Coordinates of N, CA and C and ligand atoms in Angstrom, one line a residue:
Chain A
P1 N 12.2 -10.6 21.7 CA 12.1 -10.3 20.3 C 11.6 -9.7 19.4
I2 N 12.7 -9.5 18.2 CA 12.9 -8.7 17.5 C 11.5 -7.2 17.0
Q3 N 10.3 -8.7 17.8 CA 8.5 -8.2 16.9 C 8.0 -7.2 18.3
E4 N 9.1 -6.5 18.6 CA 8.6 -5.9 19.9 C 9.5 -4.3 19.5
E5 N 10.9 -4.8 19.2 CA 11.0 -3.1 18.7 C 10.0 -2.8 17.4
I6 N 9.5 -3.7 17.2 CA 8.4 -3.1 15.8 C 7.4 -1.7 16.4
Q7 N 6.5 -3.4 17.8 CA 4.9 -3.3 18.0 C 5.8 -2.2 18.8
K8 N 6.3 -1.0 19.6 CA 7.1 0.6 20.2 C 6.9 1.2 19.3
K9 N 7.6 1.1 18.7 CA 7.3 1.8 17.0 C 6.3 1.9 16.4
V10 N 5.6 0.2 16.5 CA 4.2 1.3 16.0 C 3.1 2.0 17.1
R11 N 3.1 2.2 18.5 CA 2.9 3.4 19.3 C 3.5 4.3 19.0
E12 N 4.7 4.3 18.1 CA 5.0 5.8 19.2 C 4.0 6.6 17.8
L13 N 4.0 6.4 16.5 CA 4.3 7.6 16.3 C 2.8 7.7 16.3
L14 N 1.0 5.9 16.1 CA 0.8 6.5 17.3 C 0.3 7.2 19.0
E15 N 0.9 6.8 19.5 CA 0.6 9.1 20.1 C 1.5 9.9 20.2
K16 N 2.2 10.1 18.4 CA 2.3 11.1 18.1 C 1.0 12.0 17.8
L17 N 0.5 11.0 16.3 CA -0.8 11.7 16.1 C -1.9 12.0 17.2
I18 N -1.8 11.4 18.2 CA -2.8 11.0 19.2 C -2.4 12.8 19.2
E19 N -0.3 13.4 19.4 CA -0.4 15.2 20.3 C -1.3 15.6 19.2
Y20 N -1.0 15.6 17.8 CA -1.0 16.3 16.3 C -2.7 16.1 16.4
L21 N -3.8 15.8 17.1 CA -4.6 15.9 15.9 C -6.1 16.4 17.7
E22 N -5.0 16.2 19.2 CA -5.6 16.5 20.0 C -5.6 18.3 20.0
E23 N -4.3 18.6 19.6 CA -3.5 20.2 20.1 C -4.2 21.2 18.8
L24 N -4.9 19.9 17.5 CA -5.4 20.7 16.6 C -7.2 20.5 17.2
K25 N -7.2 19.9 17.9 CA -8.5 20.6 18.3 C -9.1 21.3 19.1
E26 N -10.3 22.1 18.8 CA -10.4 23.4 20.0 C -11.6 24.1 18.9
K27 N -15.3 19.9 15.3 CA -14.1 19.0 14.3 C -14.4 17.1 15.9
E28 N -16.0 17.2 15.4 CA -15.9 16.0 15.5 C -15.7 15.2 14.5
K29 N -15.1 15.1 13.9 CA -15.2 14.2 12.6 C -13.9 13.8 13.0
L30 N -12.9 15.2 14.0 CA -11.4 14.9 14.4 C -11.4 14.0 15.3
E31 N -11.6 13.9 16.8 CA -13.0 13.0 17.4 C -12.7 12.2 17.0
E32 N -13.5 11.4 16.0 CA -13.6 10.2 15.6 C -12.3 9.1 15.1
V33 N -11.7 9.9 14.1 CA -10.2 9.6 14.5 C -9.5 9.4 15.5
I34 N -9.6 10.3 16.2 CA -8.7 10.1 17.4 C -9.5 8.3 17.9
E35 N -10.6 8.6 18.1 CA -11.2 7.5 18.6 C -9.9 6.0 17.7
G36 N -10.8 6.2 16.6 CA -9.9 5.1 15.6 C -9.2 4.4 16.4
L37 N -7.8 5.5 15.8 CA -6.7 5.6 16.5 C -6.2 5.1 17.7
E38 N -6.8 5.7 18.4 CA -6.6 4.9 20.2 C -7.1 3.6 20.1
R39 N -8.5 2.5 19.4 CA -9.4 2.1 19.3 C -7.4 1.2 19.0
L40 N -7.1 1.8 17.9 CA -6.5 0.2 17.0 C -5.0 -0.3 18.1
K41 N -4.8 0.9 18.6 CA -4.0 1.2 19.1 C -3.4 0.1 19.8
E42 N -5.6 -0.6 21.3 CA -4.8 -1.7 21.8 C -4.7 -3.8 21.1
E43 N -4.8 -3.1 20.2 CA -4.0 -4.0 20.4 C -2.2 -4.9 19.6
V44 N -1.4 -3.5 19.6 CA -0.4 -3.9 19.1 C 0.5 -5.0 19.7
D45 N 0.6 -4.5 21.2 CA 1.6 -6.2 21.8 C 0.6 -7.5 21.9
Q46 N 2.9 -6.8 14.8 CA 2.7 -7.9 13.8 C 4.2 -7.7 12.8
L47 N 4.6 -7.8 11.8 CA 5.7 -7.8 11.2 C 5.0 -8.7 9.0
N48 N 4.7 -8.1 9.0 CA 4.6 -7.4 7.5 C 5.5 -7.9 5.9
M49 N 6.0 -8.9 5.6 CA 7.2 -8.7 4.7 C 6.8 -7.9 3.7
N50 N 5.8 -7.9 3.2 CA 5.0 -6.8 1.7 C 4.9 -5.7 2.5
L51 N 5.1 -4.4 2.7 CA 4.4 -3.6 3.3 C 4.0 -2.3 1.6
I52 N 3.9 -2.0 1.9 CA 3.1 -1.1 0.6 C 3.3 0.3 0.9
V53 N 3.9 1.6 -0.2 CA 3.9 2.4 0.9 C 3.6 3.3 -0.9
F54 N 3.1 4.6 -0.2 CA 1.6 5.5 -0.8 C 3.0 7.2 -0.6
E55 N 3.5 7.6 -2.5 CA 3.8 8.8 -1.9 C 2.9 10.3 -2.2
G56 N 2.2 9.2 -2.3 CA 1.0 11.4 -1.5 C 0.0 10.8 -2.2
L57 N -1.1 11.8 -1.9 CA -1.9 11.7 -2.6 C -2.9 13.4 -3.4
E58 N -3.3 12.0 -4.8 CA -3.5 12.6 -5.6 C -5.2 12.9 -6.1
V59 N -6.0 14.6 -6.1 CA -7.2 14.4 -6.9 C -7.3 14.5 -8.2
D60 N -8.6 14.0 -8.5 CA -8.6 13.7 -9.8 C -9.3 14.7 -10.6
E61 N -10.1 13.8 -12.2 CA -10.1 15.6 -12.1 C -12.2 15.9 -11.9
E62 N -12.2 15.1 -10.5 CA -13.9 15.4 -10.5 C -13.4 15.4 -8.5
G63 N -13.5 15.4 -7.9 CA -13.6 15.1 -6.4 C -13.5 13.9 -6.0
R64 N -12.6 13.1 -6.9 CA -12.1 12.0 -5.8 C -10.7 12.0 -6.2
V65 N -10.6 11.3 -4.3 CA -9.5 11.3 -4.0 C -8.9 9.6 -4.5
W66 N -6.9 10.1 -4.5 CA -6.0 9.1 -4.8 C -5.2 8.6 -4.6
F67 N -4.8 7.7 -3.6 CA -3.5 7.8 -3.0 C -2.7 7.4 -4.3
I68 N -2.4 8.0 -4.0 CA -0.7 6.6 -4.6 C 0.0 6.3 -4.6
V69 N 0.7 5.1 -4.8 CA 1.3 4.1 -4.4 C 2.4 4.4 -4.8
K70 N 4.4 4.3 -4.1 CA 5.7 4.7 -5.6 C 5.8 3.3 -5.2
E71 N 5.5 1.8 -3.7 CA 5.6 0.4 -4.9 C 6.1 -0.1 -2.8
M72 N 6.0 -1.5 -3.4 CA 5.6 -2.3 -2.6 C 6.4 -3.1 -1.7
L73 N 7.8 -2.8 -0.5 CA 8.5 -2.9 -0.1 C 8.6 -4.3 0.3
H74 N 9.2 -5.3 -0.4 CA 9.4 -6.6 0.1 C 11.1 -6.8 1.1
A75 N 11.0 -7.2 1.9 CA 12.1 -6.6 3.3 C 12.7 -8.1 3.2
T76 N 13.1 -9.3 2.4 CA 14.1 -10.2 1.9 C 14.1 -10.8 3.5
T77 N 14.9 -10.2 4.5 CA 16.1 -9.6 5.3 C 15.4 -9.6 6.4
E78 N 15.9 -9.5 8.1 CA 14.6 -9.3 9.3 C 15.3 -7.3 9.4
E79 N 16.4 -7.6 10.0 CA 17.2 -6.4 9.9 C 16.3 -4.8 7.7
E80 N 15.8 -5.9 7.2 CA 14.8 -5.5 6.4 C 13.5 -5.2 6.6
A81 N 13.2 -6.5 7.7 CA 11.8 -6.0 7.8 C 11.6 -4.4 8.7
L82 N 13.0 -4.4 9.4 CA 12.6 -2.6 10.6 C 12.4 -2.1 10.0
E83 N 13.8 -2.0 8.7 CA 14.1 -0.7 8.1 C 12.9 -0.2 7.4
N84 N 12.0 -1.0 6.7 CA 10.9 -1.2 5.3 C 10.0 -0.4 6.7
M85 N 9.8 -1.2 8.0 CA 9.1 -0.6 8.3 C 9.1 0.4 8.6
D86 N 10.2 1.3 8.7 CA 10.6 2.9 8.9 C 10.0 3.2 8.4
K87 N 10.9 3.4 6.7 CA 10.3 4.3 5.2 C 8.7 3.8 5.6
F88 N 8.3 3.1 5.9 CA 6.4 2.7 5.7 C 5.9 3.2 7.0
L89 N 5.7 3.8 7.9 CA 5.8 4.3 9.1 C 5.7 5.9 8.5
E90 N 7.1 6.6 7.6 CA 7.6 7.7 7.4 C 6.1 7.6 6.3
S91 N 6.0 7.5 5.2 CA 5.3 7.6 4.5 C 3.5 7.8 4.6
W92 N 3.7 7.7 5.6 CA 2.4 7.2 6.0 C 2.3 7.7 6.9
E93 N 2.5 8.8 7.6 CA 2.7 9.4 8.1 C 2.1 11.2 7.4
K94 N 3.9 11.1 6.3 CA 3.4 12.2 5.4 C 1.6 12.0 4.2
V95 N 1.7 10.6 4.4 CA 0.1 11.2 3.9 C -0.9 11.5 3.8
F96 N -0.9 11.0 6.1 CA -2.0 10.5 6.9 C -1.6 12.7 7.0
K97 N -0.9 13.4 7.3 CA -0.6 15.0 7.3 C -1.8 15.5 5.3
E98 N -0.8 14.9 4.9 CA -1.6 15.3 3.7 C -3.3 15.4 3.9
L99 N -3.5 14.6 4.2 CA -5.3 14.2 4.6 C -5.6 14.7 4.9
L100 N -5.4 15.5 6.0 CA -6.0 16.0 7.6 C -6.4 18.2 6.8
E101 N -4.5 18.4 6.1 CA -4.8 19.4 5.3 C -5.9 19.4 4.4
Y102 N -6.0 18.4 3.6 CA -7.4 18.5 2.3 C -8.3 18.6 3.1
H103 N -8.7 17.5 4.0 CA -9.9 17.4 4.3 C -11.1 18.5 5.1
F104 N -10.4 19.4 5.9 CA -10.2 20.8 6.2 C -10.4 21.4 5.2
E105 N -9.9 21.7 4.3 CA -10.3 22.8 2.9 C -11.4 22.0 2.4
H106 N -10.7 21.2 2.1 CA -12.0 21.0 0.6 C -13.1 20.5 1.6
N107 N -13.8 20.3 2.6 CA -14.8 19.6 3.5 C -15.3 18.4 2.9
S108 N -17.2 10.9 2.5 CA -16.2 10.7 1.9 C -15.9 9.8 3.1
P109 N -15.5 8.6 2.2 CA -15.3 7.5 3.0 C -13.2 7.8 3.1
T110 N -13.0 8.5 3.2 CA -11.1 8.7 3.7 C -10.5 8.6 4.6
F111 N -11.0 8.6 5.4 CA -10.2 8.7 6.5 C -9.7 6.9 7.0
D112 N -12.2 7.0 7.4 CA -11.5 5.7 7.9 C -10.8 4.8 7.5
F113 N -11.0 4.8 5.6 CA -10.5 4.3 4.5 C -9.0 3.9 4.6
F114 N -8.1 5.2 5.3 CA -6.8 4.6 5.6 C -6.9 4.3 7.1
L115 N -7.4 5.1 7.8 CA -7.2 4.4 9.9 C -7.5 2.4 9.1
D116 N -8.2 2.2 8.5 CA -8.8 0.4 8.7 C -7.4 0.1 7.8
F117 N -6.9 0.9 7.2 CA -5.8 0.6 6.1 C -4.8 -0.2 7.0
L118 N -4.0 0.7 7.6 CA -3.1 0.8 9.4 C -3.8 -0.3 9.8
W119 N -5.0 -0.5 9.8 CA -6.0 -2.2 10.7 C -4.8 -3.8 9.9
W120 N -6.0 -2.6 8.5 CA -5.4 -4.0 7.7 C -3.5 -4.3 7.6
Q121 N -2.7 -3.4 7.7 CA -1.6 -4.4 6.7 C -0.5 -4.2 8.0
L122 N -1.1 -4.1 9.7 CA -0.8 -4.4 10.8 C -1.7 -5.8 11.3
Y123 N -1.9 -5.7 11.6 CA -3.1 -6.8 12.1 C -3.1 -8.2 11.1
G124 N -4.3 -7.7 9.4 CA -4.0 -8.8 8.6 C -5.5 -9.0 8.3
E125 N -6.1 -7.7 9.3 CA -7.9 -8.2 9.2 C -8.6 -6.8 8.6
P126 N -10.1 -6.7 7.8 CA -10.2 -5.1 7.3 C -10.6 -4.2 8.1
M127 N -11.6 -4.7 9.7 CA -11.6 -3.8 10.9 C -10.8 -3.2 11.1
Chain B
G1 N -17.8 -11.1 -6.1 CA -18.2 -9.7 -4.7 C -17.5 -10.5 -3.8
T2 N -15.9 -9.8 -3.1 CA -15.0 -10.2 -1.4 C -15.0 -8.7 -1.1
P3 N -14.1 -8.6 0.0 CA -13.8 -7.3 0.4 C -12.0 -6.8 -0.7
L4 N -12.2 -5.9 -1.1 CA -11.3 -5.3 -1.4 C -10.4 -5.5 -1.9
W5 N -9.6 -5.4 0.0 CA -8.1 -5.5 0.2 C -7.4 -6.6 0.1
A6 N -8.9 -8.1 -0.1 CA -8.2 -9.2 -0.4 C -7.7 -9.1 -2.0
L7 N -7.3 -8.1 -2.8 CA -6.5 -8.3 -3.2 C -4.6 -7.5 -3.2
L8 N -4.7 -6.5 -2.8 CA -3.9 -5.6 -2.7 C -3.2 -6.4 -2.5
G9 N -2.7 -7.3 -1.2 CA -2.0 -7.8 -0.4 C -0.8 -8.8 -0.1
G10 N -0.2 -9.3 0.4 CA 0.9 -10.8 -0.5 C 1.3 -9.7 -1.3
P11 N 2.5 -11.3 -1.9 CA 2.8 -10.0 -2.9 C 2.6 -10.6 -4.5
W12 N 3.1 -9.9 -5.4 CA 2.4 -9.1 -6.2 C 2.4 -9.5 -7.5
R13 N 2.6 -10.6 -7.3 CA 3.1 -11.9 -8.9 C 1.6 -12.8 -8.5
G14 N 1.9 -13.6 -9.0 CA 0.5 -13.8 -9.7 C 0.4 -15.2 -11.2
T15 N -0.9 -16.7 -11.4 CA -0.3 -17.1 -12.2 C -2.9 -17.3 -13.1
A16 N -2.8 -16.8 -15.1 CA -4.0 -17.0 -14.9 C -3.6 -18.2 -15.6
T17 N -4.8 -19.3 -14.4 CA -4.9 -20.4 -15.5 C -6.5 -19.8 -16.0
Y18 N -6.4 -20.5 -17.6 CA -7.3 -20.4 -18.1 C -7.9 -22.0 -18.7
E19 N -8.9 -22.0 -19.0 CA -9.8 -23.1 -18.3 C -8.8 -24.3 -18.9
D20 N -7.9 -23.8 -20.4 CA -7.9 -25.2 -21.0 C -6.5 -25.2 -20.3
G21 N -6.2 -25.0 -20.1 CA -5.1 -25.4 -19.0 C -3.5 -24.4 -19.0
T22 N -3.9 -23.7 -20.4 CA -2.7 -22.7 -20.5 C -2.0 -21.6 -19.1
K23 N -1.5 -22.0 -18.7 CA -1.1 -20.5 -17.4 C -0.4 -19.2 -18.2
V24 N -0.5 -18.6 -17.2 CA -0.2 -17.0 -17.9 C 0.4 -17.0 -16.7
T25 N 1.3 -16.0 -16.3 CA 2.6 -15.5 -15.3 C 1.7 -13.7 -15.0
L26 N 1.4 -13.4 -14.0 CA 0.6 -12.2 -14.1 C 2.0 -12.0 -13.3
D27 N 2.2 -10.1 -13.7 CA 3.6 -9.2 -12.2 C 2.6 -7.7 -12.5
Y28 N 2.3 -7.4 -11.9 CA 1.0 -6.4 -11.9 C 1.8 -5.8 -10.4
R29 N 1.5 -4.5 -10.6 CA 1.5 -3.2 -10.2 C 0.4 -2.4 -9.0
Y30 N 0.0 -2.0 -9.1 CA -0.9 -1.1 -7.8 C -0.6 0.2 -8.3
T31 N -1.3 1.2 -8.3 CA 0.0 2.7 -8.8 C -1.4 3.3 -8.1
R32 N -2.4 3.1 -8.2 CA -3.9 4.4 -7.6 C -4.5 3.2 -7.2
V33 N -5.1 3.9 -6.0 CA -6.1 3.2 -4.3 C -7.1 4.6 -4.0
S34 N -7.9 3.9 -4.5 CA -9.6 4.7 -3.6 C -10.0 3.6 -3.0
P35 N -10.9 4.2 -2.0 CA -12.1 3.0 -0.9 C -13.2 2.3 -1.6
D36 N -13.1 3.2 -3.2 CA -14.0 2.0 -4.2 C -13.5 1.5 -5.1
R37 N -12.4 2.0 -5.9 CA -11.9 1.5 -6.3 C -10.2 1.3 -6.5
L38 N -9.8 0.9 -7.5 CA -8.2 0.7 -7.0 C -7.8 0.5 -9.0
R39 N -6.9 1.0 -9.2 CA -6.0 0.7 -10.4 C -4.6 0.3 -10.4
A40 N -3.9 -0.4 -12.4 CA -3.4 -1.0 -11.8 C -2.4 -1.6 -13.0
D41 N -0.9 -1.7 -13.1 CA -0.9 -2.7 -14.7 C -0.2 -3.0 -14.3
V42 N -0.7 -4.5 -15.2 CA -0.6 -5.6 -14.6 C 0.0 -5.8 -16.4
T43 N 1.6 -7.1 -16.1 CA 2.2 -8.0 -17.8 C 1.8 -9.0 -17.4
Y44 N 1.4 -9.3 -18.7 CA 1.3 -11.2 -18.4 C 2.3 -11.7 -19.1
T45 N 2.2 -12.7 -18.9 CA 3.1 -13.2 -19.4 C 3.3 -15.2 -20.6
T46 N 2.9 -15.4 -21.2 CA 3.1 -16.6 -21.7 C 3.3 -17.9 -21.9
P47 N 3.2 -18.5 -21.4 CA 4.4 -19.9 -21.6 C 5.8 -20.0 -22.8
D48 N 5.1 -19.6 -24.1 CA 6.0 -19.3 -24.6 C 6.7 -18.2 -24.3
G49 N 6.5 -17.3 -23.9 CA 7.4 -16.3 -23.9 C 6.8 -14.7 -23.8
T50 N 5.5 -14.7 -24.8 CA 4.9 -13.6 -25.5 C 4.9 -12.7 -24.2
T51 N 5.5 -11.6 -23.7 CA 4.5 -10.0 -22.8 C 3.8 -9.2 -23.3
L52 N 2.4 -9.2 -22.4 CA 1.4 -7.5 -23.3 C 1.4 -7.7 -21.8
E53 N 0.5 -5.4 -21.7 CA 0.3 -5.4 -21.3 C -0.5 -4.7 -21.0
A54 N -1.3 -4.1 -19.5 CA -1.7 -3.8 -19.2 C -3.0 -2.3 -17.6
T55 N -4.0 -2.3 -18.4 CA -3.7 -1.8 -17.0 C -5.6 -1.9 -16.7
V56 N -6.3 -2.0 -15.3 CA -7.3 -2.4 -15.1 C -7.9 -1.7 -14.6
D57 N -8.9 -1.7 -13.7 CA -9.6 -0.7 -13.1 C -10.3 -1.5 -12.0
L58 N -10.2 -1.4 -10.9 CA -11.6 -2.5 -10.0 C -12.4 -1.7 -9.6
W59 N -13.1 -2.2 -9.3 CA -14.1 -1.2 -7.8 C -14.5 -2.0 -7.9
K60 N -15.9 -1.9 -6.3 CA -16.7 -2.2 -5.5 C -17.8 -1.5 -6.2
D61 N -19.1 -2.8 -6.6 CA -20.6 -2.0 -7.0 C -20.6 -1.4 -6.8
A62 N -22.9 -1.1 -6.7 CA -23.1 -1.0 -5.8 C -23.1 -2.2 -4.5
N63 N -23.9 -2.7 -5.2 CA -24.5 -4.3 -3.9 C -22.9 -4.9 -3.6
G64 N -22.0 -4.4 -3.9 CA -20.1 -5.4 -2.6 C -20.0 -6.0 -3.9
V65 N -20.5 -6.3 -5.2 CA -19.3 -6.9 -6.3 C -18.2 -6.1 -6.1
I66 N -17.3 -7.6 -7.3 CA -15.6 -7.1 -8.1 C -16.1 -7.1 -9.3
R67 N -16.2 -5.6 -9.7 CA -16.0 -5.6 -11.3 C -14.7 -4.3 -11.9
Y68 N -14.1 -5.3 -12.1 CA -13.0 -4.8 -13.3 C -13.0 -4.3 -14.9
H69 N -12.6 -3.4 -15.5 CA -11.7 -3.7 -17.0 C -10.3 -2.5 -16.9
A70 N -10.5 -4.3 -17.8 CA -9.1 -4.5 -18.5 C -8.4 -3.7 -19.8
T71 N -7.9 -2.5 -19.9 CA -7.5 -2.6 -21.4 C -5.6 -2.7 -22.0
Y72 N -6.1 -2.9 -23.5 CA -5.1 -4.2 -23.5 C -4.0 -3.0 -24.4
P73 N -2.7 -3.1 -25.2 CA -2.5 -2.2 -26.4 C -2.2 -3.2 -28.0
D74 N -3.6 -3.5 -28.1 CA -3.7 -4.4 -29.1 C -5.0 -3.6 -29.3
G75 N -6.0 -2.7 -28.7 CA -6.4 -2.2 -28.8 C -8.4 -3.1 -27.9
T76 N -7.0 -3.8 -27.2 CA -9.0 -4.7 -26.8 C -9.3 -4.6 -25.8
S77 N -10.4 -4.7 -25.3 CA -10.6 -4.9 -24.2 C -11.6 -5.4 -23.3
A78 N -11.9 -6.4 -22.0 CA -11.8 -6.8 -21.7 C -12.8 -6.1 -19.9
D79 N -13.6 -6.5 -19.6 CA -14.5 -5.9 -18.9 C -15.2 -7.6 -17.7
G80 N -15.8 -8.0 -16.9 CA -15.7 -9.1 -16.2 C -15.8 -8.7 -14.6
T81 N -15.9 -9.8 -13.4 CA -16.4 -9.8 -12.0 C -15.4 -10.3 -12.0
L82 N -15.0 -10.4 -10.6 CA -14.4 -11.1 -9.7 C -14.8 -11.6 -8.7
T83 N -14.6 -13.0 -8.3 CA -15.2 -13.6 -6.9 C -14.4 -13.9 -6.8
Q84 N -13.6 -14.1 -5.2 CA -12.6 -14.9 -4.0 C -13.2 -15.9 -3.7
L85 N -12.7 -17.3 -4.7 CA -12.3 -18.5 -4.2 C -12.0 -18.9 -2.6
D86 N -10.8 -18.1 -2.7 CA -10.3 -18.8 -1.4 C -9.4 -17.3 -1.6
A87 N -8.0 -17.5 -0.3 CA -7.5 -16.1 0.0 C -6.3 -15.8 -1.0
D88 N -5.9 -17.2 -1.8 CA -4.7 -16.6 -3.2 C -5.5 -17.2 -4.1
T89 N -6.4 -17.1 -4.0 CA -6.4 -17.5 -5.2 C -8.7 -16.1 -5.2
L90 N -8.9 -15.8 -7.5 CA -9.9 -15.2 -6.9 C -10.3 -15.8 -9.1
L91 N -11.9 -16.4 -9.7 CA -11.9 -16.6 -10.9 C -12.5 -15.0 -11.3
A92 N -12.2 -15.2 -11.8 CA -12.6 -13.5 -13.4 C -13.7 -14.2 -13.6
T93 N -14.7 -13.9 -14.5 CA -15.9 -14.0 -15.3 C -16.0 -13.0 -16.3
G94 N -15.6 -13.5 -16.7 CA -16.3 -11.8 -18.3 C -16.7 -12.2 -19.6
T95 N -16.6 -10.5 -20.6 CA -16.1 -11.0 -22.3 C -15.9 -10.2 -22.3
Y96 N -14.6 -10.5 -23.2 CA -13.6 -10.1 -23.8 C -14.2 -8.9 -24.8
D97 N -13.8 -7.5 -26.1 CA -13.8 -6.8 -26.7 C -14.9 -7.5 -27.9
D98 N -14.7 -8.0 -28.0 CA -15.3 -8.4 -30.0 C -16.6 -9.5 -28.7
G99 N -16.8 -9.7 -28.1 CA -18.1 -10.4 -27.4 C -17.6 -12.0 -27.1
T100 N -16.6 -12.2 -26.7 CA -16.0 -13.9 -26.5 C -15.3 -14.5 -25.4
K101 N -16.9 -14.4 -24.7 CA -16.3 -14.9 -23.0 C -15.5 -15.9 -22.4
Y102 N -15.0 -16.2 -21.4 CA -13.4 -16.4 -20.7 C -13.9 -16.3 -19.4
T103 N -13.1 -17.4 -19.0 CA -13.3 -17.5 -17.0 C -11.5 -18.7 -17.3
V104 N -11.3 -17.5 -15.8 CA -9.9 -17.6 -15.5 C -9.5 -17.7 -14.3
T105 N -9.1 -18.8 -13.4 CA -8.6 -18.3 -12.6 C -7.6 -18.1 -11.8
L106 N -7.5 -16.0 -12.2 CA -5.9 -15.8 -10.9 C -5.7 -15.7 -9.2
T107 N -4.7 -17.6 -9.9 CA -4.2 -18.2 -8.3 C -2.9 -16.6 -7.9
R108 N -2.9 -16.5 -6.9 CA -1.6 -15.1 -5.6 C -0.3 -16.7 -5.9
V109 N 1.1 -16.2 -6.4 CA 2.4 -17.0 -5.6 C 3.3 -17.1 -4.4
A110 N 2.6 -18.1 -3.4 CA 2.9 -18.8 -2.3 C 4.6 -18.1 -1.8
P111 N 5.0 -17.4 -1.2 CA 7.0 -17.9 -1.2 C 7.2 -19.7 -0.6
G112 N 8.4 -19.7 -0.6 CA 8.7 -21.2 -0.6 C 9.2 -21.0 1.0
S113 N 8.8 -20.1 1.6 CA 8.5 -20.5 3.6 C 7.6 -21.3 3.5
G114 N 6.3 -21.4 3.6 CA 5.5 -22.2 4.4 C 4.7 -23.1 2.6
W115 N 3.3 -23.6 3.3 CA 2.2 -23.9 2.0 C 1.9 -23.6 1.6
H116 N 2.1 -24.5 0.0 CA 2.5 -23.8 -1.4 C 1.5 -24.2 -1.5
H117 N 0.4 -25.1 -1.5 CA -1.0 -25.1 -1.3 C -2.4 -24.8 -0.5
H118 N -2.9 -24.4 -1.4 CA -3.7 -23.8 -1.0 C -5.8 -23.9 -0.9
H119 N -6.3 -24.3 -0.4 CA -7.8 -25.0 -0.7 C -8.1 -24.0 0.3
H120 N -8.2 -24.0 1.9 CA -7.9 -22.8 1.9 C -10.2 -22.6 2.2
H121 N -10.7 -24.2 2.4 CA -12.3 -24.4 2.7 C -12.4 -24.8 3.7
Ligands
K201 K1 5.0 -3.8 -13.6

């Protein structure tokens, strides 16, 4: 069904980040990130009507990272469901990029938070 | 004491049932998110039509309990704990700034497509 195109669209960005992280390895934290993402890939083959979209990351007055939220993209209809999946994965890759760069600069549970939040927004459980 | 994520998901609409029957609708929006903490702006609506405004700081403590601090435009503060009762309902228990205590059942609004009633027990 239409669900399938979404599942495929998931594994797409998944392998995108497989590529980026593997080329950047030249790094054990990078490998644990890679582990967790391929760990979640095997559950792909769900559609949530309400999707949280982050604009980016802002560091507070101290060494506390924050994920700034744009809005929740409530897709009324089906084509909007696909199109919110699109905007969502695009902003998610965006924040992921800023996140890797920040973690190598500043050198915290932020990354596993990011990963498990993807797991949550897709499969529906904390794990 | 309940996993933090239980508060982000779903539609950002709820209803606060007070101890006496007063129902006040909550239209809220999460601005910032951390592994430990959460920030959100909240807009209440009384049954007569009065609105309010708040900024609420949610966080999980050391022992895993959910605690919150709410800031209002009346110079009034609120502080308390949030215990999840089911997937759509969590019970706030706490103390206002002048000292008066309270208990509030914050339920979330479920869409028409499905089972509205949610015991989930
Ligand atoms: K609002």
